[PDB]
Design a protein around this ligand. Structure first.
Ligand SMILES: *[C@H](O)[C@H](C[C@@H]1CCNC1=O)NC(=O)[C@H](CC(C)C)NC(=O)OCc1ccccc1
Ligand SMILES: *[C@H](O)[C@H](C[C@@H]1CCNC1=O)NC(=O)[C@H](CC(C)C)NC(=O)OCc1ccccc1
Lengths: 296, 299
């Protein structure tokens, strides 16, 4: 479980304060992105009218700081659930970057921040139910999740809230929530979660690459038959994109994706019969095919 | 929530460089006008098998050492060897040098590793110094010179530089003075470590974490003395718990209202009976690479 180095993102974190409400923002070029609920009072958060709340706001009500150095706001706008604050200085540490929306099952690093200061970095997976099992306390909103490909930071998550069950929910960098949630201090519940099949399969491939292959059988299956059985075990169905991203591991091992699926199916139907895989009786579902290839 | 969390690695990323000698390439740490790297970068194929490092080193010149920081070569103007690390004096100071210190950690302590290849950061993860002085890392060919570290305030405490992988797949290395953790040597020979044990005070800290996060099926009403717990612990190849350890757990005991020795009673029941298919914080094994401080910080 390995995070991306966080330095390129650390160089982009700032704090944003309205009155006494402070959270984190992301400073890229001359724009700071943050959760729109920074403009909320305690009682505004019960059920906020964000449009009305923002109409009462001016550039001069937003305190943006990098460290203790203030950054002057020269314009503001709301895009879905994120506030965009134009500032008078371009971040000299701006990396090459992209905003992306990730699929359930994908992993990303989270730079957990408080008051604009990074406290830690960890690797997360987006669950099928569009929550993440984060580690976030009060003041963490506006922390971001990201991948780094080559030199380019792909920003995929901004943190907004904790659900009753202790899991976390947020948006992409365009302010669109992952999943059915809304930024209201109201009662909300994640759907029942399911196992990320594509990742379990990646894990089995990883086990084969390391010589652990007792679970391979001489059978195969159709993708549709597999998907129908998997759902009976609370496993996600596979998509064509999943079959494709397993390509490199399939090529590396010589084991066809649908043969590995027949192997997983047999594991689901017969259990582990007491044996282990990569030193464990549980199947891991938070390593993507990309993650396996990275560490191998 | 709960997650294995690493320190942010920006301060260390700004110190990593590539070092090359012959056909050997690994990573170096550039602080002020010195680059630190594992000394076996001066070795060849033949050499690694049984190197006489002082002999190999006196036969080198400054210009046998190629240091690259990004696209930019740094010129080496001096070199010395301190135990198993080589110190390269360069004609340029690193402007990104953080406040730092060199520390030797104790077994059971945790630190973050910034894994690097050819002088470029690739990933960060949390490790602990095992009781047998190995670390269960993720290091591939080319990762030597990668460092482990803790951050307090704005200060980076470097505690580990990476040198090798043992046949079992665990890893070994040195502090930044070049002294190995454990009975290992920087020679290309198969080496075994002593028998490992589980870091008990960290297992307890992680059980407290599981209670803070509302996961508590393993608690019980039993109790135990410190010495009667340590007897069972040692039987199962767990480290003894000291009174200092009990004290260190105080804040976590206070937060949860579970006295340390009651948590020891829970752990004792888990050791003797096991988990019977159950899981704590999502694990089917007792985790021992979270310290009390790691739990407090994050919760
Ligand atoms: C923004 O920092 C904050 C992060 C929450 C707080 C504790 N852990 C988190 O992940 N977000 C909120 O407080 C959010 C605001 C709404 C307008 C969306 N409401 C929320 O998360 O309520 C749940 C909660 C649980 C425990 C403590 C505080 C809040
Ligand atoms: C330095 O980058 C390298 C790191 C090893 C290579 C594989 N994983 C690692 O962590 N260290 C060595 O190659 C070391 C050099 C001696 C002179 C100390 N030898 C070593 O670790 O041998 C084991 C090995 C296993 C798998 C591939 C290559 C080497």
């Amino acid at each position: 479980k390995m995070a991306f180095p966080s330095g390129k993102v650390e160089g982009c974190m700032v704090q944003v304060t309205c009155g006494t409400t402070t959270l984190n923002g992301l400073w890229l070029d001359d724009v700071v992105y943050c959760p729109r609920h920074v403009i909320c009072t305690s009682e505004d958060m019960l059920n906020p009218n964000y449009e009305d709340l923002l109409i009462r706001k001016s550039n001069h009500n937003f305190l943006v700081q990098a460290g203790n150095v203030q950054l002057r706001v020269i314009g503001h706008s709301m895009q879905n659930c994120v506030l965009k604050l134009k500032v008078d200085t371009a971040n000299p540490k701006t990396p090459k970057y992209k905003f992306v929306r990730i699929q359930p099952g994908q992993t990303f690093s989270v730079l957990a921040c408080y008051n604009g200061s990074p406290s830690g970095v960890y690797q997360c997976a987006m669950r099928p139910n569009f929550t993440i099992k984060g580690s976030f306390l009060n003041g963490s909103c506006g922390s971001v999740g990201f991948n780094i490909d080559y030199d380019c930071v792909s920003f995929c998550y901004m943190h907004h809230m904790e659900l009753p069950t202790g899991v976390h929910a947020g948006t992409d960098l365009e302010g669109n929530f992952y999943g059915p949630f809304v930024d209201r201090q109201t009662a909300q519940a994640a759907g029942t979660d399911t196992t990320i099949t594509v990742n379990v399969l990646a894990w089995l491939y990883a086990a084969v690459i390391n010589g652990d292959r007792w679970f391979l059988n001489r059978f195969t299956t159709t993708l549709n038959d597999f998907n129908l059985v998997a759902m009976k075990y609370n496993y996600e169905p596979l998509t064509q994109d999943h079959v494709d991203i397993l390509g490199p591991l399939s090529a590396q091992t010589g084991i066809a994706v649908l043969d590995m699926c027949a192997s997983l199916k047999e594991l689901l139907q017969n259990g582990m019969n007491g044996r282990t895989i990569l030193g464990s009786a549980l199947l891991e579902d938070e390593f993507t095919p990309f993650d396996v290839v990275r560490q191998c």
